Amino acid sequence: STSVKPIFSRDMNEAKRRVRELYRAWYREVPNTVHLFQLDISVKQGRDKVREMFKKNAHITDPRVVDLLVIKGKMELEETIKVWKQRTHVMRFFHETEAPRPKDFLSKFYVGHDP
Amino acid sequence: GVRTSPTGEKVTHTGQVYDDGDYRKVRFVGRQKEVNENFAIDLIAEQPVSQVGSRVISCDGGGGALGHPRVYINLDKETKTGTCGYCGLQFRQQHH
Amino acid sequence: DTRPTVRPRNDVAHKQLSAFGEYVAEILPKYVQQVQVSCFNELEICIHPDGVIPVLTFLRDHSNAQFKSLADLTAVDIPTRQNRFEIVYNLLSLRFNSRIRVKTYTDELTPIESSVPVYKAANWYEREIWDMFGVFFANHPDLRRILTDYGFEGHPFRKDFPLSGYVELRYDDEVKRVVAEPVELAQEFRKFDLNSPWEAFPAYRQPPE
Amino acid sequence: FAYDGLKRQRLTEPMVRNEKGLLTHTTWEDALSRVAGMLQSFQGNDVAAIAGGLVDAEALIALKDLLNRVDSDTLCTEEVFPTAGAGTDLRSNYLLNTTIAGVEEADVVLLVGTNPRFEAPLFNARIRKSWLHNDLKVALIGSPVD
Amino acid sequence: RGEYVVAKLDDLINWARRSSLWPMTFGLACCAVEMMHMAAPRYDMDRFGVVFRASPRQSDVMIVAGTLTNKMAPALRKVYDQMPEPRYVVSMGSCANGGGYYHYSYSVVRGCDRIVPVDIYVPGCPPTAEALLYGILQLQKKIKREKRLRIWYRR
Amino acid sequence: PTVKPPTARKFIWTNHKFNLSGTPQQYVPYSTTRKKIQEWVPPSTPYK
Amino acid sequence: LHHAVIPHGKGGRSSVSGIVATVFGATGFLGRYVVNHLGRMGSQVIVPHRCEPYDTMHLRPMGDLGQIIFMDWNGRDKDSIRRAVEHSSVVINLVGREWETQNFDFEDVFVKIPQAIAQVSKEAGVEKFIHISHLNADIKSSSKYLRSKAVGEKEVRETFPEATIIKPAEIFGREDRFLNYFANIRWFGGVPLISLGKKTVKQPVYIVDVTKGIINAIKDPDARGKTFAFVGPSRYLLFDLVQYVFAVAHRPFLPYPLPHFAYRWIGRLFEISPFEPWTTRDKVERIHTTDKILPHLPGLEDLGVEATPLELKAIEVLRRHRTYRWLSSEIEDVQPAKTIPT
Amino acid sequence: TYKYVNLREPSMDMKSVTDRAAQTLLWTELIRGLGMTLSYLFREPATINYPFEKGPLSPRFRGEHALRRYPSGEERCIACKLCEAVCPAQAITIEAEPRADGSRRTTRYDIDMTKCIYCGFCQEACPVDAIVEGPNFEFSTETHEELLYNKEKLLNNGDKWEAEIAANIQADYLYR
Ligand SMILES: CCCCCCCCCCCCCCCCCC(=O)OC[C@H](COP(=O)([O-])OCC[N+](C)(C)C)OC(=O)CCCCCCCCCCCCCCCCC
Ligand SMILES: NC(=O)C1=CN([C@@H]2O[C@H](COP(=O)(O)OP(=O)(O)OC[C@H]3O[C@@H](n4cnc5c(N)ncnc54)[C@H](OP(=O)(O)O)[C@@H]3O)[C@@H](O)[C@H]2O)C=CC1
Numbered sequence A: 001s002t003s004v005k006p007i008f009s010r011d012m013n014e015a016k017r018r019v020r021e022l023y024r025a026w027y028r029e030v031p032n033t034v035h036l037f038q039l040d041i042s043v044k045q046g047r048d049k050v051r052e053m054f055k056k057n058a059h060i061t062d063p064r065v066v067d068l069l070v071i072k073g074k075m076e077l078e079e080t081i082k083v084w085k086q087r088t089h090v091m092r093f094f095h096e097t098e099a100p101r102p103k104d105f106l107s108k109f110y111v112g113h114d115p
Numbered sequence B: 001g002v003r004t005s006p007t008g009e010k011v012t013h014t015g016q017v018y019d020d021g022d023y024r025k026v027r028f029v030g031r032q033k034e035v036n037e038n039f040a041i042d043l044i045a046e047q048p049v050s051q052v053g054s055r056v057i058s059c060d061g062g063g064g065a066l067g068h069p070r071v072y073i074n075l076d077k078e079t080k081t082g083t084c085g086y087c088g089l090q091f092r093q094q095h096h
Numbered sequence C: 001d002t003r004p005t006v007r008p009r010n011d012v013a014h015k016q017l018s019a020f021g022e023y024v025a026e027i028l029p030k031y032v033q034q035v036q037v038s039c040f041n042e043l044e045i046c047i048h049p050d051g052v053i054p055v056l057t058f059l060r061d062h063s064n065a066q067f068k069s070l071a072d073l074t075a076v077d078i079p080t081r082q083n084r085f086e087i088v089y090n091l092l093s094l095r096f097n098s099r100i101r102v103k104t105y106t107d108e109l110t111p112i113e114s115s116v117p118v119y120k121a122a123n124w125y126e127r128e129i130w131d132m133f134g135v136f137f138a139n140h141p142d143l144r145r146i147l148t149d150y151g152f153e154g155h156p157f158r159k160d161f162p163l164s165g166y167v168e169l170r171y172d173d174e175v176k177r178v179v180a181e182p183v184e185l186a187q188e189f190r191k192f193d194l195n196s197p198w199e200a201f202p203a204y205r206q207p208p209e
Numbered sequence D: 001f002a003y004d005g006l007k008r009q010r011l012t013e014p015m016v017r018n019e020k021g022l023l024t025h026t027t028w029e030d031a032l033s034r035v036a037g038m039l040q041s042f043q044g045n046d047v048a049a050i051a052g053g054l055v056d057a058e059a060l061i062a063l064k065d066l067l068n069r070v071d072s073d074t075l076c077t078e079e080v081f082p083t084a085g086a087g088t089d090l091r092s093n094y095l096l097n098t099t100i101a102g103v104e105e106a107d108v109v110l111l112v113g114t115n116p117r118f119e120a121p122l123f124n125a126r127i128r129k130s131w132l133h134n135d136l137k138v139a140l141i142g143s144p145v146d
Numbered sequence E: 001r002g003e004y005v006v007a008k009l010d011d012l013i014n015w016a017r018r019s020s021l022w023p024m025t026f027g028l029a030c031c032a033v034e035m036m037h038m039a040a041p042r043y044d045m046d047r048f049g050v051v052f053r054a055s056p057r058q059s060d061v062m063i064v065a066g067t068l069t070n071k072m073a074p075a076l077r078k079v080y081d082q083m084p085e086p087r088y089v090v091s092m093g094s095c096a097n098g099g100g101y102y103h104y105s106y107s108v109v110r111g112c113d114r115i116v117p118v119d120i121y122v123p124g125c126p127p128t129a130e131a132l133l134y135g136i137l138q139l140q141k142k143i144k145r146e147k148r149l150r151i152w153y154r155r
Numbered sequence F: 001p002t003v004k005p006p007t008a009r010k011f012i013w014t015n016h017k018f019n020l021s022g023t024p025q026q027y028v029p030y031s032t033t034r035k036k037i038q039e040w041v042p043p044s045t046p047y048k
Numbered sequence G: 001l002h003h004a005v006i007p008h009g010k011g012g013r014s015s016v017s018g019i020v021a022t023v024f025g026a027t028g029f030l031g032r033y034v035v036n037h038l039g040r041m042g043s044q045v046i047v048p049h050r051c052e053p054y055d056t057m058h059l060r061p062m063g064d065l066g067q068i069i070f071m072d073w074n075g076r077d078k079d080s081i082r083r084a085v086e087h088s089s090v091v092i093n094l095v096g097r098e099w100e101t102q103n104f105d106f107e108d109v110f111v112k113i114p115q116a117i118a119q120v121s122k123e124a125g126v127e128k129f130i131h132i133s134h135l136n137a138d139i140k141s142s143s144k145y146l147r148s149k150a151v152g153e154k155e156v157r158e159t160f161p162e163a164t165i166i167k168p169a170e171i172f173g174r175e176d177r178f179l180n181y182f183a184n185i186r187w188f189g190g191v192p193l194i195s196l197g198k199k200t201v202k203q204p205v206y207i208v209d210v211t212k213g214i215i216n217a218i219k220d221p222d223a224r225g226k227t228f229a230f231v232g233p234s235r236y237l238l239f240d241l242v243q244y245v246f247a248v249a250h251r252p253f254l255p256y257p258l259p260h261f262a263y264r265w266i267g268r269l270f271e272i273s274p275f276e277p278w279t280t281r282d283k284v285e286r287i288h289t290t291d292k293i294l295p296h297l298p299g300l301e302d303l304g305v306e307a308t309p310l311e312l313k314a315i316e317v318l319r320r321h322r323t324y325r326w327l328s329s330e331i332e333d334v335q336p337a338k339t340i341p342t
Numbered sequence H: 001t002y003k004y005v006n007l008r009e010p011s012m013d014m015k016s017v018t019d020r021a022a023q024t025l026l027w028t029e030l031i032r033g034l035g036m037t038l039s040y041l042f043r044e045p046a047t048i049n050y051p052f053e054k055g056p057l058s059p060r061f062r063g064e065h066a067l068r069r070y071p072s073g074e075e076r077c078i079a080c081k082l083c084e085a086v087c088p089a090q091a092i093t094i095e096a097e098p099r100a101d102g103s104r105r106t107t108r109y110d111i112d113m114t115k116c117i118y119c120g121f122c123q124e125a126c127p128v129d130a131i132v133e134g135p136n137f138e139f140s141t142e143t144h145e146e147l148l149y150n151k152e153k154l155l156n157n158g159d160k161w162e163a164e165i166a167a168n169i170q171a172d173y174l175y176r
C-alpha cells in the first residue's frame, strides 16, 4: 500500500534538489521584479520574503508533496516573470494592510472568543 | 397606529424605535425614518363581525383564487368569535 | 410509452450499448474494471488510471469505435473515497452517432497521464481540472491556472473548500491598490437543511451494514 | 421551555463598584486587575470559592488551580454531601451506581426522602416504565407525593 | 454681484458636462447586452448626447455592467484611475451593485463600490434598457445640481 | 383610467410620490426587530 | 456601553469596532488617511463636509454599507456642529488651511472654529476629543499660522480639558504639500533657500504614523488629557532634505541663497492668486523654521507607533516627479540624506 | 438534409466575364450597398421620445417588489417563509412572531435588492399573493443603502402601487 506513483522525485534527495533549483530562480528574479513592477520594497525585503515562504514548508518529508509545492512554486514564478500578475498580486505576499493580530492569551482574550 | 418616543422618533408597527442612547439614530439626521402609517392590526379590527347561521363557515379571503387557501372555522364556542387564520376576518354563530 | 407523463424506454439502444460495452471489456481487459449502462441509455467504462491513453486511443482510432470528439473532460470530488477524485471523459462518435463515458480515479498526490496526445481539446479541460480540483496531469504542454485569480490559493471545487473562500478584495486608499483581506460577510450564507427523513427511491436502497 | 431564560437578566459586561457604592460597567483589563490585586494580597484561608449548580468541570478545575496557587483548599459547593466517613474519597459513595439503565432490571426500588418526579423527571419516568413493564415494586420513605 | 456671476457659470459648465456624457466602452457580462440595447435604435442614447468611446482618457462615465470578479478587479480600478476628471461611475445590475446572485462566491467582488466610488445604482438583473436610461438621466440631474463654483466663491 | 378606473382601497396612497433618492425624503434602511437580549440592570442602592 | 457599541467581529470591514467618530476636515490630506483607518476596522464615521459632494467620493469606498455618513456644516454655524457630534463618542478635528482666504483667515480656522467645535462637543457629552495642532506652534512665531495654532491650542485645552492634543511635525505622504512642494520648485529653475537652508533643521513624520497615533489615541485611555508630539526618527538640515528630494526625483538641483526680505516678497506675489496659492508668505516662514525639540511631551513610541524613516517612503511620494528616463530607478539608488545626530 | 452555403462556380462566357470586370472596375456592388443605407436615411426612425414615451410592457413584467394587503387593509403575508426558501439569491430575510391579536405576522421582511435577480420565484411560491414584483422599473438610487428594503419600505411600495398591481394580477391570474 505504501507503494505510490511518483510525481517526479523518487526520494527526498531528488526532491530537495528541485527545491534548491527553485530557490535559485526566485532569488535571481527578485531584483527584476522590484524593478519591473516598480515596487517600493527593497531587493533585500523581497529576498527575505522568498526565504520566508521557503521556510513554511521546511518540515515536509513526503517526496510527492514536495514536488507539488515545487510545481506550484514554478507556476507562481512564471506569472511573475511574464508579468501576468500585477503589482497588487505581488504585494499580497506582504499583507501590508492587514493589521497585526495578537498572539498571546490576554490580548486575544480582551478582543473576543477566538482560540 | 403610529406613536412617537420622547426623543421624537416614530414607532413602527413592529414596536421598533431606537432608544435614547443608541448612536444608530444618526442615520436619520438630514433624512427621514420610513414608517408605513396603515397599521394592519388597526385596520383588521375595524371590520364588522359576520353573523352566520351554521356551526362551520369557510373563508377564502375574498376574490376566489385571488385570496388565500380556503379554510373552515368552527363556530361552536359562543364566548368568542371564529377568526380566519389567514386574513383575520371574524365570524359568529347566529344563536342557532 | 403511452403513459403521458413517463419518459419512454428505448430498449434497442440499451441492447446495443450493452453489447459494445462487453466489446470494449473483451479487447482491453488489462484496464477495464467495470462497464454499465443506465436506464436512460448511457454507457460507462470504468478503468484503472493507467489505461487513460490506451483506452482513449483505442476508442478514438478503432474502426468499430471512432470516438473522434471529446465532448467534455471534468472531475467529481467524493471525499468519502480514498481516491477522492473521479475523472470523467465524455466522447462522441459521429460515425455511429453514439456517446460513451470513460471514468477513472486519482487522489491529491497522484498524477494522471495528460490526454493531449489523443485529443487536443483536453489541453484546456485539464488546466481547469488542475485549477479547480488540484489534480496534476503528467506531461502537459503547459499546466497552470486558467480560471482562478493570479496567486489564488486552493482549489475551489473541492467539497471541503468553503463557498465564499478565504480571502476577499477591496481597494485600499492608503496603499493606492486593490488589497486582499480575510473574508467577512455582512450576512452569512444561510445553510438550509432540506433532505427529507423519508426514503424517496426504494430501488436505490443500499444494503444494511 | 426554560431556554427563554437565556435572553433575560444576562450579565454582558464586567462591572466594578464606583465611589457611591453602585455597580458600574468597566473593561476586562480594569476588573481583572482589581481582582488580581486582592487575590495577590490575600493568601491561605483568607481566600474561598463557592461553585453553583450550573458550573462545568473546566471552570471548576481552573478555579481550583488558581486558589491552590495562593494555597487555599477552600473550594466549596452550594450542595451539601456528608463528609464524615469515606466522604468523597470513594466515587461509589456519591454516585448512582446502578445507572439509569439498571432501573429496568431491578426488582425492588426503595426511594428514601426524595421526590424523583420533580428532582429527576426522566429518572422518575424510567421507574414508571419498569413499574409498568416489569412489575417493579416501589416503596417510599418520605412525604407522600404523587 | 459675484454670487450671481458664479451661479451662471456653474450652470454653464454643469450644462456642458451633463449634455456630453461619454461612457467608456466597458462592459462585463449579461448587462452589457442591455447596455447595447440602450444604444440601439429604439432608445438611441446618442440622441441625449451620450457617446461610447473606447479610450478611458476620452471618457466621462464608467458604466460597470456585469459581474466583477477578483481577477478583473484591478483592471477595473486601473481604467477608472486613467479617466480624467470629472468622472462618474454608474453601477448597473445586481452583480455590480452588490454581487447579486454570485454574492456568496469565492471569486466575486461583492459590489463594485468596494473598488470604485459609485454615483448611481441601477437595480435589476438585468435592468431594462429603459431602466438604465432612467439611471443615466438621473446622473444628468445629479450633475445639474453641482455647485463647484458657488462653493469656490465662499471658500 | 378615465374609462376603466382603478379599484379604490382606503390604504392606497392618494398622492403619488416620484423618486426621492438624493433628497431629505429618501429611504434610509434600518432593522425593524426589537432587542433580543435584555441586560441585567444593577441595583441602584448602596448595598453593604 | 450601549448594546450597539460593543465590539464584535475580527476587526475587519464588516466588524463593529465600537467607535463612533465625527471627523471634521476629513476631506484633506490627513482626513482621508484617518477615515480610511477608522473604516477598516468597522467604525461608524460621521464626515461633516463644507465642500461639494463630488470631492468626497474617494471616502465612499472606505467603509462598509451605512458606516460612512456625510453631513453639511458651516464653520460659523453651531447648530450644524451639534447635529454632527451629538451621536458620536469621539470627535476629531483636522480643520485647517495653509493660507488665508477672503472669508476664512488663520484666526478663524485655527482658533474660532476648533473652539466652537470643542464647546459644542462637550455640551453634547462627547467622551473623547482629539485636536491636531502643530509642533512649532508658538505665541512669538513669525508665522501667523503658527501663532494661531498656539492660541487655539490653549482655547481647546480650556474648552475641553480632557482633549487629546497632537502636535505633529511636517507630514510627508502622497498628498503632503511638503516633499511635493520641494519637487515642484523645479518649475522655477533653481531652489531659493534662506541662508542656503543650512540654518534650518526639520524632522518630518510619515502620514501613516500620524494616522496610527491618532487611532491609538482614541482607543487608549491614557492618552486622554495629554499633549503629544509626533516627529520623525531623524533630523535633517533643510539643505540636506531638499537635496535628497531632488536626488530621489532625479532632478537637477541648483540651490541658491535668497535673503529673507526678498523671499518674503516672492511670497507676497504668489498670494495674489484667487485659487490655491502656490506659496504664501506664511509658507516661507514655516518651511524655514527649525522644528522644536519637546522632550517633556510624549511621542509616537508612547502611543505604540514606530516612526517610519523618510528613506523608506520618499520614492513612494517622489516617483511621480521623475521623467521617463528615471521612473524605474529603485529605492536603493540614491544616497541617504545626512542626519543631524541628536 | 443539407445545402451548400458557398459551392457554386462562375460562368466563363465572354459576357459574364465582362460583367464581372465591370463590377470590378466600376464598383457596382459597392454602389449597391450605398443604396441600401440611403434607403434607411428616408425611413422613419424607430426611436421613441423617452421619458415622455415608454417601451411596451406586459402584465407579467417583473419589476420592483411590494407587499400586499387584503381589501380590509390587513397584510396578506402570513410569515410562512416559502418565498425565503425558494429565493435563488437568498435576498429575503424574514423573522416572525405572534402579534398582539395572535396573528402570524412578520417582524422583519427584508429584500436585499442588490442580491435579487428579479426572477419572480418568490411571487410564484407565495400562497396568499403577499409578495409581488410590481410594474415599476424606475427606482435608481444614489446610494447602495437605499436599495436594501425593509418591511416598511415594501409595505409602502404596495400601498403606492396597489392600484396598478391589482389590475395586472387580474389580467394574468388565469394563466397561473
Ligand atoms: C473652444 C473650445 C471650448 C472652450 C470652452 C471654454 C470654457 C467655457 C467655460 C468657462 C467657465 C469657467 C470654467 C471653470 C473651470 C475651472 C475648473 C473648475 O470648474 O473647478 C472648480 C474649481 C473649484 O476649485 P476649489 O477651490 O473649490 O477646490 C479645489 C480643491 N479640490 C480639488 C479639493 C476641490 O474652480 C476654481 O477653482 C476656479 C473657478 C474660477 C471660475 C472663473 C473665475 C470666476 C469668474 C466669475 C466670478 C468672479 C468674481 C465675481 C466677478 C463679478 C464681476 C465680473
Ligand atoms: N503637514 C501637515 O499637513 C500638517 C498639518 N497639520 C494640521 O493637521 C490638520 C490637517 O491638515 P490637512 O488636513 O493636511 O490640511 P488639508 O487642507 O489637507 O485638510 C484640511 C481640512 O480643513 C478643512 N477646512 C479648512 N478651512 C475650513 C473651513 N473654513 N471650514 C471648514 N472646513 C475647513 C478642509 O476642508 P475643504 O477641503 O472643504 O476646504 C480640509 O478638509 C490641520 O489642522 C493642519 O494644520 C499639522 C502639522 C502638519
Ligand code: SF4
Pocket: E029, E030, E031, E032, E065, E066, E067, E092, E093, E094, E095, E096, E100, E101, E124, E125, E126, E127
Ligand atoms: S446583474 Fe443579472 S444580467 Fe447583469 S451580469 Fe449579473 S446576472 Fe447577468
Ligand code: SF4
Pocket: H083, H086, H087, H088, H089, H090, H091, H092, H111, H115, H116, H117, H118, H119, H120, H121, H122, H123, H133
Ligand atoms: S425575485 Fe427571485 S431573487 Fe428576487 S427576491 Fe424574489 S425569489 Fe428572490
Ligand code: SF4
Pocket: H076, H077, H078, H079, H080, H081, H082, H083, H084, H094, H125, H126, H127, H128, H129, H130, H131
Ligand atoms: S410573502 Fe408570502 S411566501 Fe413570503 S412569508 Fe409572506 S406569505 Fe409566506
Ligand SMILES: [Zn+2]
Pocket: B059, B060, B061, B068, B084, B085, B086, B087, B088, B089
Ligand atoms: Zn380568510
